Every structure is written in structure tokens, then in C-alpha cells.
Design an enzyme around this catalytic site. Structure first.
Site, PDB file in Angstrom:
ATOM      1  CD  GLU A  35      -3.130  -0.803   0.137  1.00 31.97           C
ATOM      2  OE1 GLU A  35      -3.921  -1.745  -0.087  1.00 31.97           O
ATOM      3  OE2 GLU A  35      -3.157   0.264  -0.500  1.00 31.97           O
ATOM      4  CG  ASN A  46      -9.002   6.361  -4.270  1.00 29.51           C
ATOM      5  OD1 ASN A  46      -8.073   5.618  -4.558  1.00 29.51           O
ATOM      6  ND2 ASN A  46      -9.341   6.617  -3.028  1.00 29.51           N
ATOM      7  CG  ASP A  48     -14.289   7.814  -5.296  1.00 27.41           C
ATOM      8  OD1 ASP A  48     -13.144   8.176  -5.004  1.00 27.41           O
ATOM      9  OD2 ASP A  48     -15.024   7.309  -4.436  1.00 27.41           O
ATOM     10  CB  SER A  50     -12.240   9.123  -1.978  1.00 25.95           C
ATOM     11  OG  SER A  50     -11.951   8.004  -2.781  1.00 25.95           O
ATOM     12  CG  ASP A  52      -6.795   5.134  -0.977  1.00 24.72           C
ATOM     13  OD1 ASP A  52      -7.977   5.361  -0.671  1.00 24.72           O
ATOM     14  OD2 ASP A  52      -6.467   4.271  -1.811  1.00 24.72           O
ATOM     15  CG  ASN A  59     -11.281   5.724   0.071  1.00 25.15           C
ATOM     16  OD1 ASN A  59     -11.941   6.739   0.220  1.00 25.15           O
ATOM     17  ND2 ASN A  59     -11.235   5.070  -1.079  1.00 25.15           N
TER      18      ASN A  59
END
Ligand code: CL
Length: 128
Positions: A35, A46, A48, A50, A52, A59
Site C-alpha cells: 500500500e 482515487n 471518484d 476520494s 487514500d 480512504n
């Protein structure tokens, strides 16, 4: 902060992750490697809208507030910036809530695709 492998393994264990909800410590170290490469300051946007955050790439759609994710929740009740600290307490506590939410560590796509079903104990081999 960029952790060393064994240094992070020790910090995660002190904070209660070893066998939390049945996942041994190697699973959590493997997940953090893929990660974030063990970097507490990792961020990734991301598609959309959002983002992380942190060593476990938590998220903002669901788990933390960054003030820029419309329609999101903040189930860990923290600012996303708290997940970027050199102290991993906030990330660990939020990760425990995530992993308890019904899909286990499948909530982390990198764990499912790069750790699940592998010899994850290797990630803690050699560590004091
Ligand atoms: Cl599970």
C-alpha cells in the site's frame, strides 16, 4: 516517516494488530509494504475524488475527513491528516475498524492481490 520492515512490525504488534480478527502480523506488514512502501506520508487520489492516506492507505470516502470528498463519511472520526503522522496509532485504530466491517482484509485491494495466500510470515522473519 519511512519505516523499516522490522521497526514497523514491532510498532504494529505493540498496537494490537498481531492476530487481530485472526490476521497474523505478517499480513499487516505485507499490506503496508504494497500500500505505502512503509511510508506514513503516502497519499493517492482515487478516480471518484476520494483519497487514500498513510501507511495503510485508508480512504476518505468512508473513514476519515479531508474536507474535499463530497458525500463521504468519517467513520473513524478523525482528520485524514492524522493518518500521515510518524505515530501510527491513528492508522492502526482506524484499520481495526475497517477489518471488522465484514470483508476482513479484503478491504485492502493490495492485500487481496499481493498478500492473500502467500507466505506472509516472511515479512516478519528475522525480526526481534
Ligand atoms: Cl476475516
Amino acid at each position: 516517516k519511512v519505516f523499516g520492515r522490522c521497526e514497523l512490525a514491532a510498532a504494529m504488534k505493540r498496537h494490537g494488530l498481531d492476530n487481530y480478527r485472526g490476521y497474523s502480523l505478517g499480513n499487516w506488514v505485507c499490506a503496508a509494504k504494497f500500500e505505502s512502501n512503509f511510508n506514513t506520508q503516502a497519499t493517492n487520489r482515487n478516480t471518484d475524488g476520494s483519497t487514500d492516506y498513510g501507511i495503510l492507505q485508508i480512504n476518505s470516502r468512508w473513514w476519515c475527513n479531508d474536507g474535499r470528498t463530497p458525500g463521504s463519511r468519517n467513520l473513524c472520526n478523525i482528520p485524514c491528516s492524522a493518518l500521515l503522522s510518524s505515530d501510527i496509532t491513528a492508522s492502526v485504530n482506524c484499520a481495526k475498524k475497517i477489518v471488522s466491517d465484514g470483508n476482513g482484509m479484503n478491504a485492502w485491494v493490495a492485500w487481496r492481490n499481493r498478500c492473500k495466500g502467500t507466505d506472509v510470515q516472511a515479512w516478519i522473519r528475522g525480526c526481534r
